[PDB]
Each structure stands twice: as C-alpha cells, then as structure tokens.
Amino acid sequence: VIGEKFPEVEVKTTHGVIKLPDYFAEQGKWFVLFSHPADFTPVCTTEFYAMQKRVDQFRELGVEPIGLSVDQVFSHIKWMEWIKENLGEEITFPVIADDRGELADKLGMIPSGATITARAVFIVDDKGIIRAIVYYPAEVGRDWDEILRLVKALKVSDEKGVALPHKWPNNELIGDKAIVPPASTVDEVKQREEAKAKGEIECYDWWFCYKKL
Amino acid sequence: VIGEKFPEVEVKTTHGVIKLPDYFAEQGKWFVLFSHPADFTPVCTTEFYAMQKRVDQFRELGVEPIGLSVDQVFSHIKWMEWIKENLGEEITFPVIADDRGELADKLGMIPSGATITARAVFIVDDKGIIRAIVYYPAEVGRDWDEILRLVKALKVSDEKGVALPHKWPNNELIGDKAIVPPASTVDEVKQREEAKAKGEIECYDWWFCYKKL
Amino acid sequence: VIGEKFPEVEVKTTHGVIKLPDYFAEQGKWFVLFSHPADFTPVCTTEFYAMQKRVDQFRELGVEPIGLSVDQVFSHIKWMEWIKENLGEEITFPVIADDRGELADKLGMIPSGATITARAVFIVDDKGIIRAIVYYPAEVGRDWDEILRLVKALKVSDEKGVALPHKWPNNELIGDKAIVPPASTVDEVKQREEAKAKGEIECYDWWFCYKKL
Amino acid sequence: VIGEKFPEVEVKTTHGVIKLPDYFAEQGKWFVLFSHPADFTPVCTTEFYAMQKRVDQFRELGVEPIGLSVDQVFSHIKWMEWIKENLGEEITFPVIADDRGELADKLGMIPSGATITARAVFIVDDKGIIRAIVYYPAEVGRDWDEILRLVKALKVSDEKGVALPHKWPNNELIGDKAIVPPASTVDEVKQREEAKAKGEIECYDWWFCYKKL
Amino acid sequence: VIGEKFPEVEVKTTHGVIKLPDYFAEQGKWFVLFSHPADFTPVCTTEFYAMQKRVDQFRELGVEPIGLSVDQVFSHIKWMEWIKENLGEEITFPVIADDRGELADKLGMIPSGATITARAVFIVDDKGIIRAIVYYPAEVGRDWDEILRLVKALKVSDEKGVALPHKWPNNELIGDKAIVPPASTVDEVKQREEAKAKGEIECYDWWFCYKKL
C-alpha cells in the first residue's frame, strides 16, 4: 500500500547483490520497480525492449529502472543476450532473481491463484517511500510512456509543491499548467483572491486555481 | 451526558485546525456546538442563516458558535459561499469536518440506524463542562432563540448563584426575577424568613423565594 | 438515543400504575415524558404550573404529558395540592414516582455526579419510538412553548411527509411553509425541475424546495 | 446485627450534612435511629408527633433521636411544617433523606418485596456500638415508651454493671430492683452467700440475686 | 427479614418434637417464638414467669408462645420445675432445645461475638410468614406487654384491613381508632372526600383518615 516505506530487503540481481532501497536512496536516486511473469516470454520481451529504449529518459530524471521475476540469474542474462541479438538492444538496467518469490509475496505482486508475479509497477523515491502502484494482468503489456508521464508529474509535484491535472503536460483544459492545492480554510481563501487579482495565479474558482512553471 | 468535561479532541475546521475545548476555554470563552446532517440541504441551511443572523448576540455573551458535520471542508466552504450569494449572509463562525464521525460517535450525536449526525446542540463553558444537551430530528429545525434564552439563563445562574424560572426572562408568574435556590436545612429556613421580613427576597413559601437582579 | 424504542416498563404514577408506552400507544396517543429533580422546589413548580396551563394545547394533539421525579407518590399529590391551593391551577396530568431512579437510569436522565433526575424531556409517538430528547440542568427552567412548537412540527412532518425550517411556523425565510426533502438522485432533481414550472413548489435550488400546506 | 460497630457513613439531614456515628459519639451522646416508610403518611405522623412530645426525655438521658426515610429533604421539612400547624408541634430532631436507600440497605431496614424502609429502631451508644434492634411492620406504630424503658435499662445496666428484670422499673417480682449477673463459677458462688448473709444483696438462689440502686 | 417465610424446620421441645411453622399453621394458630440465653439465669426467669401469667391472653388470640435456648431438654424441664416449686406458676408453653444453635443461626439470633442466643422475638402468622422481629441484649429483659399490644395490633390490621397509630389503642391523637391506608392516587383522594362528608371517616388530611371499629 502507498505511502509506506519500502521493505529493507536484500536482492540478488543481474548487476550484483544489492541492498534495497538503501542502494538507490543513498545515491539521491529514485527507482521504478516492475515485475514480469517469466524470462523468455513474448509480451514481457516487448516491454523490456521498450524500457531499454527509454532507460535514459528515466535515468535522466534521476530515476533508476529495475526489473524482477522468480527466474534465476542465468536465464535472466541469457534472455537479455537474446534481446541484444534478435532485437539488437543491450539490456542495461538491473533484474531481480526473486527467489521463490520472497519479495514478490511481501509486495502483493502475485495474483489470485498464482505462484508467479504479474505485471506490477512500483514507484519509490529517494526517501524509500512508495509513491504509486500499478497491477496489470499477464495478458497485457504496460505503457512506459504513461509510467513516464506519472514520474515527471511526481518529480515536479515535489519540487514545486503543486498538483498535476488529468493528462499533464497535455491537459485539455489548462495544458501544461500546474494546479494550486485547493484551499481548505477561509483565510486561505483570501490568499486565493489576493493572488488572482494582482495576477500570480488564474482561477476557475477559489478551490480550482492554476499557474505556469 | 451533562456535567462531564468535554473530550480533549482536535478538529479540522473551516477556519483552521483547532484544539477542543482548549481553544475556547483558554480565551475565557464558552461555545455552543451544533450538528447538521449534510452540507447543501434545506432545513440545515435555514438554521445556518439564522445562526449567522444571531452570531453577535451569542458572541456578545462571550459565547462562540461552531457547527459540525461529516462532510469535507471543501463542500463546507462551498455551501457557505452559497448562503452569501443566495441569501446574502456571509457565514462567519467555524464549521467542523467531522471525519468519518470520529467526534460525533464520542458525543452520541448519531441516531439509531444512522451513519450521519442529527440535530444536536451542546453548551460547553470556559472550564470545558458540558452544560446542556439537545437532540432534535432531521425533519425539524431548531430554534436559536430558545437556545439563546438558555445560555443567558446559564450565564446569569453562574454569575449570581440563582436559578431561573420556567420561561425566564418572561416567566408568567415572577417575570424576569431570579429564583433563590430552595433551602434544604432548618437553619437555612430561618435565613429565608429573616430575609422576607426586612425585604431582600419575596417568598411564596420558604422553598419558593425570588428577587430582582 | 433518537429513533430507538421506548423500553417496556411498568410505572407508579399519581393516577394509577400504567404500562409504557402501552398505555398511550394503545389508545393511539403520543406522550411527553419529562423529569424534575424534586417536589417542593421553585423552578420545578414554575414548570408544572406552566404545563398545566398548556395541557389542553398538547391534549388536543393526541400528545399526553407525564412527569417523573424520584419522590414518593404521597409527596407528589401534596405538591399538586399546594399548586392547587396556592396558584389556582389544578395539576391534571400524571406524575411517576420512580423508586431509586430505576427508570431515570435506563434513560440516563442522571447528570454526572448525583443520584437525582435533572430536567429531561423525551417525546414519544404512538408506536413507542423516541423522537426527540432534551437535557436541561436544574438551574434553568425549560420553555414549554419550544416543546409545544417541536411537537406541532413533528405531527406535521409525519402526516404530510415533509421537513420543517428553522423556527417554523415563523421561519425568517418562508414563514409557515413546509420544506421538501432534498432530491438525492439525478432523477429526483428533474422531478423538482418539472414541479417548479407548474407552480407546485417554490425553489432557492433543486435541493431547497418548499410549499404551502 | 447487634454488638457490631455502626457503619461510618455520611448523611444528608434536615439539620445539615452530618457524619455518623462520629457526630454523636464525639459529643458523649448516644442515639436512637428509627425509620419510616414515607413523609406525609398517617401512622408515621402519629409517631413523629409522639417522639417530639418525648424528645426531652430521650435528650435528657444524653440520648439523641434521629429519623430516616428515602424521601428528599424538601418533603421532610414540608411535612414537619405540617405537624407544627395541624398538630401544633414543631419537630426538633434531625431527619435523614436516605438517598435511594444507600444506608437502609446496609442496615437491613427493608422488608421482603420492598424498595422502602419499614418501622425500624436502632439504639447506638457513644462508642458506636449498636445495642438493640426492632423491626415492626408498616401497618403498626411503635411505642416510644417501650423504646424509652429499654434505653434507661441500658444506661443503668452500663453505669452499674447490672441486668434488668422483665418490665423494669415495674417488675412484678422484684419491682425496680436491679439484677446481679448470675454467678458462673464455684468461687463466685461463695461471693453470693457471703453477700446474702451480711445483707448487701437478696437471693431467690445463687444465680438469681438482686439489690436496690 | 420481615415479610419472609419461616424456614421449614423440625425442632426438639419440652412438649415433643414438632415441625415449624406446620404445627401451628396446620391448626391455624400464630405463634411467638422467643429466645433466651440460658436456663437458670435471672432476667431469663423473670420473663418466663411473666409469659406464663400472660399465656392465656395470647392463647385467646390464636397466638402460641414458644421459646428457645441452646440448653438440653433435661436442663429446661428442671428450670420449669424450679419456677413451679419456687414462684407458684407452672410453665405451660413449649421450649426448644436447639442443639449447637442450628436454628438460632438461620434466624441469626446470635449477637456479634458469642455462641449463644440473645433475646429475640419473632412473630409469625398462620401462613408461616414473619411479621415482626425484635433483638434485645441479655442485660435488658423484654416487656411482654409491648408484644401483647403488637400482636393485638396485627390481628386487627389483617381482619379489618387497616393500620394502627402510635401506641394504639391508647394513641394520644385518636385513642383506639383505626387509621385508613393513605390514598395514593387522585381517584383515592376523592374516595376520601366523599367518605368524610357522610361521616364514615374523620380526617386531619386526605392522607390522614381514621375511624371507629
């Protein structure tokens, strides 16, 4: 569940034995953890390919990607050699060999009826706080562009203490403008009008206010 | 139940996060808490309007009014904007967003069968003591003039160590005269006659005595 | 607590021993049960007098008054005879001699700190159901008019299926008009729209509708 | 039950809040506590009248009378005003408003089936020891002259270490002579004959001996 | 405790072994059970003598006297023979030899501190019901006249449905008149009004009515 710290938990990965979330957190970095059913499978492969393609967009935001399945490291690597040779993309982000699903269990990555992970995504910042969560089925690949929009929103949201409208930065109504957290007190309301008159923010109403970054 | 101190309990309100009863008590002030079913409803609105109209009568007695419902602050404020625009009365006293009914539960504001507050009034002084309690139904609006009479009686009652007759200050029998707490001991009885003869009080009997303020 | 059933109970009164609510609900009458601390006290006398000059107003309605203190029957009738002899009114409604507070306690009419009833009013329909409750402290006499008003309000709400505005039938916004129960589905709102055009109800909003009786 | 100390217990009375038995005991005084069903009743009134008439006989023995019922102080006093006006005897001894029968319970003053006291008398000395106990029914008034005989006997009995014959001071056999506690040892028997010869006591037998005061 | 049933019990007396109350209630007679500490003691002798000179007074009424100490039967009859030989009266009522106090204990005739009966009187009707109780200490002999009076009072109350005044039939306010049970409903008071006019009862008040037998 959201807002909880991330379990302090150690993982065997393709790039080494690492400590979570300490390894990313101590480096200022955030990370998007995501789980896939099984190495050497179709949909899963389309997703890995696509992440690699976008790895520098995530990374460039200070956001480290990392995958995970119940498979063992040797089939992880082998499958990644495959993507380098048949799709021609060297996979460059770490993958978790989640042994027996130690961690998957703890994170509710498993669906009803199952002993393998699903299609889960977790976004976790540099203070170890889980920020958002996604569970799609086996039968449907994710969209990393939606997962990308989200993170940017979050980054901005924290950096500027603002909310982001539906579909930001392409909101049909206020475009790429950021939303002012709606006011909750009568005195905070005077701060909204004080701001509208004099032109810092724009306001459909006292609760609905927005500005540019 | 009457005479109990008021639970030390913190509230989110329209005018801010405040502490009850410390906030009023530490200021010398008393307060009349009253609960309503739901923002944006007919009867409830007629009552809020009416309180605003009388807010300076209460306040002038050192008696602060404050409302409460299970609604959230944003619909509180919005509904109050409504009363300012359709009735033309800016609502000026605090309202409690009673989350899930934390507080309502504690105060027995809820009727049999229900998950929303009723039509309750509590009068609570500057030592946090609950002084009186009213529970009317959803289907009937209160009378703030009766709630007003009562408080004045109380104020006077404490200031002068006197009781107030039925319907004071317009008692059919002794008018706006205050009642002498009936004597309970044979020696206290001599103090009644000693007082009647010599003219300080007037007496239908030794238990039934009264005077002017 | 409101909405709840009046406990079945057998009580000793000045007029007989009766079963409540049965005695009144049997006949199809409502009743107002009210409590006073003790016979031969002043405020308590002012309210018995006042009730007796109101008794037929209530009695007209199918509402029966009935009182209660922890005093013995003999004490009661003596007090009633004092009121007869000394003020011109003969008390003509029953009063319950409530041994050791056995009823006062189920209804929790007992204020924090003491072994005697305070000033309580319970109003009960012809089905033994509890419609309204009022706990006033000893130092402040009630106002039998406010209760008269409340009962009138109640009887109306039930017979016409309506609600009542602050201080009805003298409300500041609509005098003695009845309020229509707020529309609470999209379908009920249109029901309102179509009723406004067709002058069957006037409206401040789709949720604020009233009418003449 | 006899011989027990009297419960240390505080009472609201007509003459004030007092502490029992400390209040009488600390003053050297004894007291006769007696209970009556209800203020304003026939038999009970005949008894109160009669006690007042004899109050100076009891008091003169250092024996303070005090009454008690479950009624409240205001009806106590009121009923006493009655006796002053219709019989013309100001009642001058304290009466207990035994709230809910706190004390009556403790003393077994209540009969089978009942929530009111009966016709009980307790004699209790200046060391708090209960000396004697009487329970008559509702339907029969006491005899204060029998209760008076008894106390005198007791007073004398303690002052002189003697027993009192049936009906003292008008015993058919030995008149107002006091009885010598029958001897219980062979050596104590020699003290009886030693006393008969030489004329201090008179003796029907060695166990049955008596003398004048 | 009064109003309660006399425990069923089989006792060894000087006249036989009998079952109580059965032996008396069977025949339709009442009985006075009384206890003394011990045979061959002085006060105890003065009261046995006195009872025997009263026995036919009681016996006339359907009241049977019966005594009890913790002494063995042989001891008892020896004592009775001493009273015969030494004072002219032959004891002619039974006396219970109560082994180890087995009955004295159920009736709790045992005073705080000791293993022997004191001076107790229980009066019991022909239905085994306990009408009055009296616990006198050893140092003070009883007055068989007061008990004679009490029993007379009782028998009357039952046969005529009345109550009795202080010290009846020599009451200071009405001699040997009977008291009418206080009217306790508004209807019973009128019943009294109409009986006074029509000279069937005299009255100090509606609650204080008497009559000749």
Q: Which amino acid is at C172?
A: E
d(CA B183, CA B187): 9
Q: Which of E112, E174, E205 sits opposite D1 (nearest CB)?
A: E112
Closest CA to B118 of B127, B126, B109: B109
In chain A the first and final C-alpha atoms are separated, in Å, by 31
Q: Spell out the residues 6+ positions from residue E23 whose beta carbon is closer than 8 angstroms to its own.
A: none
d(CA E209, CA B81): 73
Q: Which residues from chain C sit within 8 angstroms of residue B87, using beta carbons? A: 173, 204
D84 touches chain B (CB under 8 A): no
CA atoms within 13 A on the CB side of D42: 29
CB–CB of E15/E97 below 8 Å?
no
CA atoms within 13 A on the CB side of A48: 32
CA atoms within 13 A on the CB side of E196: 14
Tokens found for residue B90:
């800016």
D116 touches chain C (CB under 8 A): yes
CB–CB of E30/E151 below 8 Å?
yes
Parse chain D into domains and list their residue ranges.
Answer: 1-142, 143-213
Contact at CB, A207 and B78, closer than 8 angstroms: yes
d(CA E139, CA D176): 15
Strands (E), chain C: 9-12, 17-20, 30-35, 63-69, 95-97, 119-124, 130-136, 178-180, 202-205, 208-211
Place of tokens 């007029």: C15
Give A174-213 as a DSSP string: TBTPEEEPPP-SHHHHHHHHHHHTTTSSEESSSSSEEE--
Contact at CB, D100 and C78, closer than 8 angstroms: no
Residue in B180, B186, B188, B204 to test binding to D, most D beta-carbons within 10 Å: B186
d(CA D184, CA B43): 91
Q: Spell out the residues 6+ positions from residue B78 whose beta carbon is closer than 8 angstroms to its own.
A: A207, B39
Phi, psi of D72 (to 5 degrees): -100, 160
C104 touches chain D (CB under 8 A): no
Is residue C204 classed as helix, strand or coil in its secondary structure? strand
Q: Which residues from chain A sit within 8 angstroms of residue B14, using beta carbons? A: 185-186
CB–CB of C120/C133 below 8 Å?
yes
Helices (H) and strands (E) in chain E, counts: 7, 10
d(CA A33, CA A122): 5
DSSP element (H, E) containing C154: helix C144-160
Tokens found for residue C1:
């607590």
Q: Which of D39, D99, D115 sits opposite C75 (nearest CB)?
A: D39
Closest CA to A55 of A85, A86, A80: A80
d(CA A170, CA D116): 84
Closest residue in E to D2 (Cα–Cα): E111
Phi, psi of E142 (to 5 degrees): -70, 180
d(CA E144, CA E54): 8
d(CA B172, CA D55): 45
B106 touches chain C (CB under 8 A): no
Q: Spell out the residues 6+ positions from residue B178 whose beta carbon is closer than 8 angstroms to its own.
A: B156, B160, B162, B163, B164, B165, B168, B210, B211, B212, B213
Closest CA to B103 of B26, B18, B10, B22: B10
Is residue A159 classed as helix, strand or coil in its secondary structure? helix
Residue in C43, C44, C100, C116 to test binding to D, most D beta-carbons within 10 Å: C100
CB–CB of C64/C24 below 8 Å?
yes
Q: Cα A183 to the chain's mean position, in Å?
A: 28
In chain B the first and final C-alpha atoms are separated, in Å, by 31
Q: How many CB atoms lie within 10 A of CB A187?
A: 11
Closest CA to B179 of B141, B207, B137, B146: B207
Give B171-203 as a DSSP string: BTTTBTPEEEPPP-SHHHHHHHHHHHTTTSSEE
Q: How was this structure determined?
A: X-ray
3-state helix, strand, coil in chain B (%, to 5): 35, 25, 40
What single DSSP character describes residue E171? B
CB–CB of A71/A39 below 8 Å?
yes
* E119 appears as a binding residue in the annotation: yes
d(CA D26, CA D37): 30
Going by the annotation, the residues of the binding site of B are: 119
Radius of gyration for chain B, computed over Cα atoms and rounded to the nearest angstrom:
20
Residue B88 φ/ψ region, left for φ over 0, alpha for ψ in the -120 to 50 degree band, beta for the rest = left
E208 touches chain C (CB under 8 A): no
Tokens found for residue B35:
């609960």
Strands (E), D51-208: 63-69, 95-97, 119-124, 130-136, 178-180, 202-203
DSSP element (H, E) containing B131: strand B130-136
CATH 3.30.460.80 fits C1-142, yes or no: no
Phi, psi of E25 (to 5 degrees): -65, -30
CA torsion sign for C130, C131, C137, C143 is: negative
Helix ranges, chain E (H)? 22-27, 42-52, 55-60, 73-87, 102-106, 144-160, 186-196
Q: Which amino acid is at A63?
A: V
Q: How far is CA C147 from CA B51, B112, C63, C120, in A?
A: 20, 22, 11, 12
d(CA D107, CA D130): 11
Domain A143-213 fold = Antioxidant, Horf6; Chain A, domain 2 (3.30.1020)
Which subunits count as partners of chain E given 3+ CB pairs below 8 Å?
C, D
Closest residue in C to B149 (Cα–Cα): C143
Q: Which amino acid is at D71?
A: D
The DSSP bridge pattern shows strands A119-124 and A30-35 to be: antiparallel
